Symmetry: C3
Subunit: 510 residues, 3 copies
């Protein structure tokens, strides 16, 4: 459990979240404006080349419900009809070679954009739809300034714009390029017609392309849109000296309670519990489990685990082991090997039981459990545990917490111990009395059978059985490293155990 957090870091290292589907629902005030292109031919001044529409950019600033919002609109037309009027071939007759008009068969496009969060990084959009209201575009009065004679005026023209389909588009300009929202509008001819006064043309529906605004600042229409777009999870599109952080640990040296520590080290403190409560203040939250894992699977522990896996696989499959490497006792196995007297051999064989402890081949208190409990106590009670600094501190912890530990194995009422400090014992279960430590049997048992972690190691167990005379059940449970009886003793206030626990603390400090 408390070592299952390490096993989980390992397992989920492959993951070493970023996007989010955000829904947006906001009201808008589309204020657009037509624009006309007027090219007058030379000569006397009686001949006009074209009278057409021009896409017109228009940036404005209106008031939302307690916010001031800048916006930017661009109106355009498609499918307009090209009419013309030629009354004579002489330089003194009024002629307009080709002018554009809008009718049913045409459509009116309006690109819209704001500075809001919806259009900040909008490149992908689905579930798009909008409810727009209909308006009325009325043309104005443009006086064709002829040199001499009369002055025809194109006056009138009304047309109702009704909502239509919506899409995306891009407003291109010489400064900014904007991924914008394209509203379509259909046209219904109204009663006011446009007619050129003092001319033989009148009673023709449409809108004139000389003064469509009719001296207005804009044409206003309000709307609402609802869509779902893609945006990065992070809505935005010195820390310490490690010596001094070690001194912060030395300030949190020793004062973990023992009942509380043993109760804390019996909880599956999974990723959520382990990275939620720690220091209760961070904005980013950008997968800090991944941020610590990317440094966790770069260290000696992880490389040694992978080396164990590869020596097992290779040597099993076909590979011979170098003359320095030797098989002690039974058939070859990384678990049973003298890397390279008996003290040395047993320490070397114990250096892999640390990996057994974090390969789910344990039976008891699983020392890495207590190491992780201490870690979760320290990074909780502390404050300089910044997400940049927790990576490689979890690894310094996992690699420098409780280096000198000890293990044991049980076989038919006969226990065989071992430790990385070069110590090796063999002792009976019922009546503790040492035995000649049996090599070629300790290896054969520890290779396969479940191993136990010697928090109650044979020295302390002897001292305890001697002074605090022990019952059979208590002895069996201490051998099996049972937290129930361990905490019953810690509440019985047994100094022979409190000393061992304070020594574990002084060894798990750093």
């Amino acid at each position: 459990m408390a070592s299952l957090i390490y096993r989980q870091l390992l397992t989920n290292s492959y993951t070493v979240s970023l996007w989010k589907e955000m829904q947006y629902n906001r009201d808008i005030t589309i204020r657009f404006k037509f624009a006309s292109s007027i090219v007058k031919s030379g000569g006397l001044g009686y001949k006009w080349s074209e009278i057409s529409f021009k896409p017109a950019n228009y940036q404005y600033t209106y008031t939302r419900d307690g916010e001031e919002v800048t916006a930017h609109t661009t109106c355009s037309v498609n499918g307009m009809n090209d009419f013309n009027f030629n009354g004579g071939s002489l330089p003194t007759d009024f002629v307009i070679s080709r002018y554009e008009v809008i009718k049913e068969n045409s459509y009116v496009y309006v690109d819209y954009w704001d500075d809001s969060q919806a259009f900040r990084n909008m490149v992908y959009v689905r579930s798009l739809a909008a409810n727009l209201n209909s308006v009325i575009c009325t043309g104005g009065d443009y006086s064709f300034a002829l040199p001499v004679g009369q002055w025809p005026v194109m006056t009138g023209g009304a047309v109702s714009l009704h909502s239509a389909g919506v899409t995306l588009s891009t407003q291109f300009t010489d400064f900014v390029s904007l991924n914008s929202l394209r509203f379509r509008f259909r046209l219904t001819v109204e009663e006011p017609s446009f007619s050129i006064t003092r001319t033989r043309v009148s009673r023709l529906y449409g809108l004139p392309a000389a003064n469509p605004n009719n001296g207005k600042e804009y044409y206003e229409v309000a709307g609402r849109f609802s869509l779902i777009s893609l945006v990065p999870s992070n809505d935005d599109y010195l820390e310490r000296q490690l010596g001094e952080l070690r001194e912060e640990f030395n300030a949190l040296s020793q004062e973990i309670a023992m009942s509380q520590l043993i109760d804390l080290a019996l909880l599956p403190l999974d990723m959520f519990s382990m990275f939620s409560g720690i220091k209760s203040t961070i904005d980013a939250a950008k997968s800090m489990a991944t941020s610590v894992m990317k440094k966790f699977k770069k260290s000696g522990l992880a490389n040694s685990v992978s080396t164990l896996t590869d020596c097992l696989s290779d040597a099993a499959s076909s590979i011979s082991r170098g003359a320095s490497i030797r098989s002690v006792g039974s058939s070859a196995s990384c678990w049973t090997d003298v890397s390279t007297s008996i003290s040395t051999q047993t320490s070397t064989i114990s250096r892999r039981l640390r990996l057994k402890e974090m390969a789910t081949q344990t039976e008891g208190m699983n020392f890495d459990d207590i190491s992780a409990a201490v870690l979760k106590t320290k990074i909780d009670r502390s404050t300089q545990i910044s997400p940049n600094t927790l990576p490689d501190i979890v690894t310094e912890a996992s690699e420098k917490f409780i280096p000198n530990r000890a293990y044991r194995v049980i076989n038919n009422d006969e226990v065989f111990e071992a430790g990385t400090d070069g110590r090796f014992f063999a002792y009976r279960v019922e009546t503790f009395d040492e035995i000649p430590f049996d090599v070629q049997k300790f290896a054969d048992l520890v290779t396969d059978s479940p191993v136990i972690s010697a928090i109650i190691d044979f020295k302390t167990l002897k001292n305890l059985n001697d002074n605090y005379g022990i019952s059979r059940q208590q002895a069996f449970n201490l051998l099996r490293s049972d937290p129930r009886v361990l905490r019953e003793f810690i509440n019985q206030d047994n100094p022979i155990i409190r000393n061992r626990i304070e020594q574990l603390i002084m060894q798990c400090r750093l």
Copy 2:
């Protein structure tokens, strides 16, 4: 079946969308050049420039049974600027500058279609195409001079060979297209271009006056294979009354649920996949349901209480203020024996913390939340109104409001101590069930460390059964330990004192 709860809590850190798709498609690029003439003033013998322009062409051509709308845009770069002046007079034929295509120059062609490969193509890798080489021959452009003979530029042939491919963007006044950029190199051929009635001929290249030769387009076939990045949901181009209805559906299917098969299902490690693959129809290409449910799951009473238990063991182990403050019954306070709010009160307050022993792996028996999850799975699989959009926060409301009033027990040397959130507490013996005074300050020290077991077989029904349907020692031990073997044995032997308890639990998981 609480493995779903455990894995949700564990993988809540992850809180998929995009997808790598391969597209291998044929194309018929029907492209076209366009020339830009500018004729100087004076008489009409003087030409300012004769150059190229980016030339767009949109059309609609037939695929193998599909009508595909397409869009091409051709252009040339690195062309050579030749000139030719017959003199300095207003009447002499002069072309101050004209562009010609040679080997050193390159031809660019942007291509786009209305198929699926191009709708949201913004990132691409493994890009490659198999294009064939073509030939391009010059046209016949008759320079209109005011008076006299009529020179005509005629000839020129250059072969276009396929080359590297990349991306580009075809801008217009109406649309903007994320397009594919085919590049082409040039190699001279035998037909050379020359102006009739003029002292120039037998020089290689392709003129820029009229490349199309009057052809409506030049056509070249190809195929392209690539790998692009796109959103999963292909839709990026082109609750009180409902929850009450679902409550009613649960409170009408609860009794239609069975007991034997439910106990059979409650021994299954139903992982995320096992729970979210067997949806009724996998309705339409749903999102990551684990993330969808978790982003609601980790805001609730359950998860916040887990975090509180965590932090109250943490601070308590860090400094002695919290342990000393929680005011336990006595003889330890790690965090668990805390009374926020007599015996009844303490026991209920402690059992509301024992609610986490189930999803803390501190159990040994039937693990009641397993039954809750199983009933949830059964109902959301046999229901019709359950949507993937409303299942988030329903997987949380169920976990939070299933079996609010529940009971737990602890065994210690042939002495069994029960307790419940409803404020009940019974102490008794294992073999000969006989009530006994309940021992506070011992029940707490035992439930802290010793494994805790669920009260599906609680003392009341246990004693009714021991009287009517009197039981043997091994079966009684296994009922205490809540074994599925003996439980299913009784459920197949049709014991109504267990069937009624199970139906009660069902009426409590009704929601």
Copy 3:
């Protein structure tokens, strides 16, 4: 454990990453240039209609710290003031209707772009910052080409460019479109003023809009930028016929003692994909690649279908699916010589009991996964597109026939997918009629065990290599300790069975 890896694959199926937040910090040499637009009115040539600025593109190639980098810089100005100077209403007096001048109120924009990686796919950016140094920009000598008269020369003018905020922009052209970075610069007038000679204008500050480059090839200013952008993790965005034979060549070369030592380890995803000397792309996407095919197979579909049938057997009861049930009642764990047929059919779901964590012994799929991890670290032919569906063909075709047992009151009931059943007592091996309709009621709920030590070899062993009570109980329970102890005692009646298991783990 070695089956827990399959259960974990199934669990993490929801993850079936691609993007990443990368930090780029690179040095750059901003070599920009101004450009002016001199428009001359008609008449004689003394009257100037306008002298404005123009967006000035410049494309070049410069040397970074061991790199040769191609770059592109676009200079522009904004908020420049418009001054005028008229010497008379005649066509023969030197007049400039409008000329643009620079002061504090104005700003200078510079769009910058390179061919490096930082600019290849820059579409999203955050935490943008930059360190730029200030420079001085001065105007040259633009001689107004008067047909006749004096020669006015606009000369002088200097301005100090101080850094300002940075943003994004897009440089558009008739050839290329570049997602570029917009460096903005504020201006402070310097001591040298701009003045037109042989003309009544002097001792006025700013930068002349006529010749701001001063005849230079560029204005060089160094800089550095830092950002955090989104990028595809795959850093490139901008053919079984012989595999089976390799497996069957590697099958028996593998040993047995060390294989059993390795088949007890929870070789989770890290441990399973660490010893693979993968490619730069496989190490990034291996797990999801194999998972997207692992949840497409008969194994996954059968698991999901058992789950669907358990849900439907708990719900349907009022209309309960009455297909068949031998035993107490419908379970969907027992859904069906007739006896041999039923047993094989039940064993095709005891494989799911195996990969559902409801076993006690060596859990044959675990041995299969151990063989897999021992073969795919040796096989030379392993590749990113290749391991996916090899993991699945392995999981599907390793040990097709496999047997199981259930113990009840010292009476073992066996079963096998090969249509064989054996009932027998633990202490005294002697067969018994196989009790169907009880074997099912027991295998349904009681734990099951695997047939690594199956009855045939078990009896051969109890005959030849006389066996003790505890050793026999542990061999029934399928204990790896006693298993490895026999394998080290060199018992051919177990070595042969293990070799058979290998040869079935063949692919």
